[PDB]
């Protein structure tokens, strides 16, 4: 389904643009599903839009501060790094 396809795209991007630090597919899935739970994303593909990136950081930051749950924030740090790197690579090539 779309959820699994997005996890696989993100995993691949992370391998290319992070490397050794890459989060596992289930960690990416936990982060993505939590963001859906909190209403930040409708479709899992909404994560790809640069317009969602600051809202996601804010929400996961808030979760760490209020619940002491920072796992998803750490995963996002890696995912966002890879997404920014990918976008920047596309920008400079285009």
């Amino acid at each position: 389904s779309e959820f699994e396809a997005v996890i696989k795209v993100i995993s691949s991007a992370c391998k290319t643009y992070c490397g050794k630090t890459s989060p596992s597919k289930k960690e990416i899935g936990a982060m993505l599903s939590l963001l859906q739970k909190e209403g930040l994303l409708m479709s899992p593909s909404d994560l790809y839009s640069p317009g969602s990136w600051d809202p996601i950081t804010a929400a996961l930051s808030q979760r760490a501060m209020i619940l002491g749950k920072s796992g998803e924030l750490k995963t996002w740090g890696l995912v966002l790094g890879a997404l920014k790197a990918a976008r920047e690579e596309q920008v400079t090539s285009e």
Side-chain angles (χ1 to χ4, degrees):
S1 79
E2 190 180 4
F3 188 83
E4 297 82 6
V6 169
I7 287 162
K8 285 179 220 311
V9 168
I10 295 301
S11 185
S12 186
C14 283
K15 285 177 192 172
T16 305
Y17 292 104
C18 318
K20 299 190 172 182
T21 352
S22 186
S24 63
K25 289 186 289 299
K26 294 191 191 172
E27 280 167 292
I28 296 161
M31 175 205 74
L32 192 51
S33 198
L34 175 69
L35 293 169
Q36 291 176 284
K37 183 218 166 202
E38 297 297 334
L40 274 100
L41 310 174
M42 337 264 318
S43 165
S45 66
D46 290 344
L47 197 96
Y48 294 148
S49 186
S52 63
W53 297 349
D54 289 339
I56 289 155
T57 298
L60 299 179
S61 176
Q62 286 284 323
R63 175 177 172 80
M65 285 190 288
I66 294 161
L67 309 178
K69 292 176 167 193
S70 64
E72 296 83 4
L73 183 60
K74 297 183 180 182
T75 302
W76 174 240
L78 294 150
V79 172
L80 175 61
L83 292 176
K84 282 186 160 189
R87 186 202 61 182
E88 282 152 16
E89 168 93 83
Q90 146 152 44
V91 160
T92 58
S93 286
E94 175 195 40

